[PDB]
């Protein structure tokens, strides 16, 4: 599923993402936009390390989910990577929450640092009723 902006903002809000671990909804929106263009089916294979990023939050197979083809990988969210390719983003959100519980917080995604950190992200939630 490819979410429309405001539709996604309320979906994330209903799922408990607004201010989760101090992370605003605008920050999560900026992250998903740059990570997958709001596409839950988005996938990126990393030939260099044999891992794959799955879904709307491009969660990596090396540590967060299991796809059975990533050497010596862990499954910290305890989910099949298939779960991160569903139209329903409940499982992806549960895993995204798990990622940010670690030391780095939202900084776990290099993309967030590159395109969201210290940026004006107001634009992502404007007019969405969140």
Curated annotation (Swiss-Prot):
Keywords: Amyloid, Amyloidosis, Antimicrobial, Bacteriolytic enzyme, Disease variant, Disulfide bond, Glycosidase, Hydrolase, Secreted, Signal. It is found in: Secreted. One of its GO terms (molecular function) is lysozyme activity. The active site is at residues 35, 53. InterPro entries: Glyco_hydro_22, Glyco_hydro_22_CS, Glyco_hydro_22_lys, Lysozyme-like_dom_sf. PANTHER family: LYSOZYME C. It is linked to Amyloidosis, hereditary systemic 5: A form of hereditary systemic amyloidosis, a disorder characterized by amyloid deposition in multiple tissues resulting in a wide clinical spectrum. AMYLD5 primarily affects the viscera, and the predominant clinical features are renal dysfunction of varying severity, and intra-abdominal bleeding. Inheritance is autosomal dominant. Lysozyme C is capable of both hydrolysis and transglycosylation; it also shows a slight esterase activity. It acts rapidly on both peptide-substituted and unsubstituted peptidoglycan, and slowly on chitin oligosaccharides. Monomer. It comes from Homo sapiens. The gene is LYZ. SUPFAM superfamilies: Lysozyme-like. It catalyses: Hydrolysis of (1->4)-beta-linkages between N-acetylmuramic acid and N-acetyl-D-glucosamine residues in a peptidoglycan and between N-acetyl-D-glucosamine residues in chitodextrins. Its EC number is 3.2.1.17. This is Lysozyme C. The lineage of its organism: Eukaryota, Metazoa, Chordata, Craniata, Vertebrata. Residues 1-130 form the C-type lysozyme domain. Disulfide bonds join 6-128, 30-116, 65-81, 77-95. CDD domains: LYZ_C. One of its GO terms (cellular component) is extracellular region. It comes from the Eukaryota.
């Amino acid at each position: 599923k490819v979410f429309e902006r405001c539709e996604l903002a309320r979906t994330l809000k209903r799922l408990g993402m607004d201010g989760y671990r101090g992370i605003s909804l605008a920050n999560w929106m900026c992250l998903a936009k740059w990570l997958s263009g709001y596409n839950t089916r988005a996938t990126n294979y990393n030939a260099g390390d044999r891992s794959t990023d799955y879904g709307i939050f491009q969660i990596n197979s090396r540590y967060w989910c299991n796809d059975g083809k990533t050497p010596g990988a862990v499954n910290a969210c305890h989910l099949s990577c298939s779960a991160l390719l569903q139209d329903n983003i409940a499982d992806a959100v549960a895993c995204a929450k798990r990622v940010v519980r670690d030391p780095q917080g939202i900084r776990a995604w290099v993309a967030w640092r590159n395109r969201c950190q210290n940026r004006d992200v107001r634009q992502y939630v404007q007019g969405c009723g969140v």
